[PDB]
């Protein structure tokens, strides 16, 4: 007998690809997808609780594969700037000044609350005070990869990388048996981490079976600079140092030559596409369809709210689906089904969670999002997945579960106090603004 | 002489002068016009019949959707994954020939207008069939519109040929002679569907009536090259030679722009109507917006139709435009948030020839206004409300909409439409078309 039976108009399981189930039901038990079946059959099975969801599309929860969640408190603080001046003259100085453990707890919770409301059940974070990030994640009920920030210089909470790594080990330790949080390593970028630190990270990840997330090939200037100073592209450097592989998550990759493509194919590394951030900083255009056609796993992320500036993964996914057609020069590139897969299954693959989350298969965790497609602007619906990708906003998100626990009920966050978070964000904004 | 309505938002963005935002000011409306913008104390001391507090909201000129095919809302998501010519010839044109009746147009247009008002659009341009029926729906909705008479080389719904389309348009131009909200324009579809004769016809008609022309131009590489190979001139050169270009010409799309094109737009003071999401989705290309803007071309923005977008979200289109423009031009300072808002308001006004009536919050202009709510969680903290509007707000933040001081949207609710009935009607159309 199920704990919960959901009866939506449409289910999109993502696996197998391209299909939509009409008048079916999904049964949840013990925090897992126990059955997907026609309604008659599923109803005959019975459940503690039943929820009809007419006009709704039920999908795997969205996976935001790259972000810096507490930068939510810097939303819109630094517009109109290309990458290097954005970092050096605005963001880094503001991080040195403001970012404490209290900043991180408030900013992360604000970010989570925003993400759950837009259907995101799993997220990747690359930001300071990971220990604090995990406490907030733990309380929220959502799933996360938390990457340990490794940089060649002092950062908030870590005078240097050895301290960041040592704090990282303590964290790996504690969370060994957490159902929802995975620790990973977060070397920032090629130009802010040495060969030595990169090797220590590799060995640690061999030893711990952990992931690596890094900004790679964000800008032409990063690549040309690396070519002129070291005579090798930053990706070949990473390949030479042995970091590439199925647990390596290369974020951005707007600069991809044919050697780059060959390396990603060979090693089976994931690329995390951040289209809006790459547009906003004038970083370039990640060649998504090309990567996809070559078999590279391509997930999607929002990046931070100072270079987006929302945490809307559904919106990011639409932007990616539109952009990819014109970048590639074919209207058939990254169709709605594949765009949804990028937002779900490919994120789970990128984070090493494909066996737990990312599709609606029996036995997987019940990380689910229900989207409402009954609104005036979504009519008429010829294809619900098309309507999701190209004509629905994140405000259509009604319900969200993680591991079968409901975190959003008819648009209301069950584990957060929006009114308190807003008052808190506001307090932060006035102190940072003054 | 108190205002009819006094609006008290946290922020006002007047658009003119550019780049400014007023805090704790107020906008008084009288006789359908902006009577005054003033600090809140002064405004309140003046007096008003009705007063609306708008804490946490940003008041702006209403958004101007400068290109659409409004009744194609009933084809929303019907023809995905197709480039332009096969989208048109193998899908959309057949579906239009099969379904577009006066009834289709009434239902589809109202559906589109209701979607748009909810998204903060007070003025829109239509280029679609049965313009007469369109005007009836616009008239009832209270919204402002340019309605473009479709001119094509073949039979269209409601016009067996060009001659007949223009017949109806004259009558329309006449009937709507004194209309406060509705302007009639001509809508030659595209260079490859409109002959030179028909083009010369429109020029003289528009000279005589002092009316506008809107036309899809230089949408794709293939159109520019086929024209070059068949006729030895670029469509925009052909239009220049024919004498159509000028301050009342609205060139839609323009993803293909060389220096000669650029000179002709600059010389003639023609407008470009940028449709970023449609250009991306049909794999048409990238309009060089910042280049146009730096050359001093007026660039406005449109959603296009719901079968190549597929929403009618102008604010979302404006966000797309503002992001894309940076990366297309290769500088993070291109199309900043204030200018993107300008593109969605005042430039759309200039494009439609309505800049003296709308597009900015200056005294004496029409009170076409939109209130965006920036007090939501995902919009905190607000450092700069216009940045937040463009880069971090959805169209569901739109709370209130007025056109000519008449409220069309009140706290998210439409005062002139029945959403429940429109939905039911959209669904019937949906069932028939899919069956
Ligand atoms: C890798 S630790 C997180 C660090 O990365 C910085 N960051 C935030 N957003 C981006 C960042 N870095 C590089 N690329 C641009 C963008 O993805 C952030 O400010 C912080 O300093
Ligand atoms: C002048 S009538 C408007 C006509 O243009 C067609 N159209 C709709 N959306 C677009 C159209 N035409 C050309 N370019 C692609 C896009 O803007 C529409 O289906 C209708 O046939
Ligand atoms: Zn990042
Ligand atoms: Zn975004
Ligand atoms: Zn069009
Ligand atoms: Zn859109």
**H helices, E strands: number in chain A:** 17, 17
Residue A338 belongs to a domain? yes
Q: Does one domain contain both A260 and A178?
A: yes
Q: Which of A76, A377, A426 sits opposite B391 (nearest CB)?
A: A76
A residues 355-374 closer than 8 Å to B (CB): 374
Residues 6 or more apart whose CB falls under 8 angstroms from that of B399 comprise B54, B57, B371, B372, B373, B409, B411, B412
For A123, phi then psi, to 5°, come to -140, 155
Ligand 3 is an ion; its neighbours by CB within 5 Å are A 303
Residue A98: strand, helix, or coil: helix
Q: Does one domain contain both B163 and B294?
A: yes
Residue B360 belongs to a domain? no
Is A335 within 8 Å of B81 when comparing Cβ atoms? yes
Nearest one of B285, B310, B67 to A331, comparing CA atoms: B285
Q: Does one domain contain both A29 and A176?
A: no
Q: Are B403 and B144 in contact (CB under 8 A)?
A: yes
Q: Tell whether B226 lies on the interface with A, counting CB pairs under 8 A.
A: no
Q: Are A251 and A214 in contact (CB under 8 A)?
A: yes
For residue B130, whether the previous peptide bond is cis, meaning omega lies within 30 degrees of 0, is no
Residue B431 belongs to a domain? yes
Total domains present in chain A:
2
CATH number for B36:
2.30.40.10
Q: Does one domain contain both A206 and A96?
A: yes
Residue B359 belongs to a domain? no
Q: Does one domain contain both A386 and A257?
A: no
Q: Does one domain contain both A121 and A138?
A: yes
* Measured CA distances, A258 to A8, A126, A141, A220, A263 (Å): 45, 29, 42, 15, 9
Q: Tell whether A278 lies on the interface with B, counting CB pairs under 8 A.
A: yes
Angle at which helices A234-241 and A258-267 pack, to 10 degrees?
A: 30
Residue B185 belongs to a domain? yes
- Indicate the residue among A299, A319, A351 that finishes a domain: A351
Residues 6 or more apart whose CB falls under 8 angstroms from that of A131 comprise A167, A170, A171
Residue B394 CA to residue B377 CA, distance in Å, equals 12
Please give the DSSP secondary-structure letter assigned to residue A61. P
Q: Which of B326, B377, B384 sits opposite A279 (nearest CB)?
A: B326
Beta strands B249-253 and B271-274 are parallel
Residue A266: strand, helix, or coil: helix
Q: Does one domain contain both B138 and B243?
A: yes
Q: Tell whether B98 lies on the interface with A, counting CB pairs under 8 A.
A: no
Residue A278 CA to residue B324 CA, distance in Å, equals 9
Helix (H) or strand (E) segment spanning residue A370: strand A368-372
Residue A359 belongs to a domain? no
* Residue B6 token pair: 């006094």
- Indicate the residue among B352, B382, B405 that finishes a domain: B352
Q: Does one domain contain both B8 and B156?
A: no
What is chain B's Cα-based Rg?
21
- Indicate the residue among A317, A351, A385 that finishes a domain: A351
CA distance from start to end of chain A: 57
For A181, phi then psi, to 5°, come to -110, 130
Helix (H) or strand (E) segment spanning residue A40: helix A39-45
Is B285 within 8 Å of A326 when comparing Cβ atoms? yes
Nearest one of B353, B406, B388, B426 to B145, comparing CA atoms: B353
Q: Which of A329, A379, A428 sits opposite B427 (nearest CB)?
A: A379
Q: Does one domain contain both A297 and A216?
A: yes
Q: Tell whether A69 lies on the interface with B, counting CB pairs under 8 A.
A: no
Q: Tell whether A395 lies on the interface with B, counting CB pairs under 8 A.
A: yes
Residue A116 CA to residue A402 CA, distance in Å, equals 10
Contacts 24+ apart (CB under 8 A), A358-361: A358/A14, A358/A15, A358/A60, A358/A63, A359/A13, A359/A14, A359/A15, A359/A60, A360/A11, A360/A12, A360/A13, A360/A14, A360/A15, A360/A26, A360/A33, A360/A36, A360/A58, A360/A59, A360/A60, A361/A13, A361/A15, A361/A33, A361/A36
Nearest one of A185, A238, A319 to B391, comparing CA atoms: A319
Q: Does one domain contain both B68 and B57?
A: no
Residue A356 belongs to a domain? no
Which residue does chain B place closest to A386, by CA atoms?
B77
Is A393 within 8 Å of B392 when comparing Cβ atoms? no
Q: Does one domain contain both B176 and B76?
A: yes
Please give the DSSP secondary-structure letter assigned to residue A394. G
CATH number for A177:
3.20.20.140
Give ligand 1 pocket residues (Cβ under 6 A).
A 68, 83, 91, 95, 126-127, 149, 186, 188-189, 215, 218, 277, 303-304, 307
Test the B interface: residue of A71, A304, A377 with most B CBs within 10 Å: A377
Structural domain including B302 reads: 62-352
Q: Does one domain contain both A80 and A46?
A: no
Residue B207 belongs to a domain? yes
């Amino acid at each position: 007998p199920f704990d919960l039976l959901l009866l939506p108009t449409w289910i999109v399981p993502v696996e197998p690809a391209g299909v939509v189930l009409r008048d079916h039901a999904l049964g949840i038990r013990d925090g897992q997808i126990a059955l997907v079946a026609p309604r008659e059959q599923a109803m005959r099975h019975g459940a503690t609780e039943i929820r009809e969801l007419p006009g709704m599309l039920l999908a795997p929860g969205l996976v935001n594969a790259h972000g810096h969640s507490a930068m939510s408190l810097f939303r819109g603080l630094a517009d109109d700037l290309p990458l290097m001046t954005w970092l050096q003259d605005h963001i880094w100085p503001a991080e040195g000044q403001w970012v404490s453990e209290d900043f991180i707890r408030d900013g992360t919770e604000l970010a989570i609350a925003e993400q759950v409301k837009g259907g995101i059940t799993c997220f990747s974070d690359m930001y300071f005070y990971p220990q604090a990030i995990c406490g907030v994640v733990h309380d929220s009920g959502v799933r996360a990869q938390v990457a340990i920030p490794v940089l060649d210089f002092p950062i908030p909470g870590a005078r240097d990388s050895a301290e960041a790594i040592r704090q990282g080990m303590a964290l790996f330790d504690d969370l060994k048996h957490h159902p929802r949080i995975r620790i990973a390593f977060g070397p920032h970028a090629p130009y802010t981490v040495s060969d030595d630190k990169l090797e220590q990270i590799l060995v640690l990840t061999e030893e711990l079976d952990a992931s690596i997330q890094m900004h790679v090939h964000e800008t032409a200037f990063e690549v040309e600079q690396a070519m002129e100073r070291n005579g090798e592209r930053p990706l070949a450097r990473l390949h030479r140092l042995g970091l590439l592989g199925p647990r390596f998550q290369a974020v951005h990759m707007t600069q991809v030559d044919n050697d780059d493509l060959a390396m990603l194919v060979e090693t089976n590394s994931s690329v995390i596409h951040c289209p809006e951030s790459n547009l906003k900083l004038a970083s370039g255009f990640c060649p998504v369809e090309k990567l996809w056609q070559a078999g590279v796993n391509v997930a999607i992320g929002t990046d931070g709210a100072a270079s987006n500036n929302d945490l809307d993964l559904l919106g990011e996914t639409r932007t990616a689906a539109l952009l990819a057609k014109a970048v590639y020069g074919q209207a058939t590139a990254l169709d709605a089904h594949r765009a949804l897969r990028m937002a779900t299954l490919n994120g789970a693959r990128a984070l090493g969670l494909e066996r737990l989350i990312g599709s609606l298969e029996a036995g997987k965790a019940a990380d689910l999002v229900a989207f409402d497609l009954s609104g005036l602007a979504q009519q008429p619906v010829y294809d619900p997945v098309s309507q999701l990708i190209y004509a629905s906003g994140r405000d259509c998100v009604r319900h969200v579960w993680v591991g079968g626990r409901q975190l959003l009920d008819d648009g209301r966050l069950l584990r957060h106090d929006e009114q308190r978070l807003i008052a808190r964000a506001r307090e932060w904004g006035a102190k940072i603004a003054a």
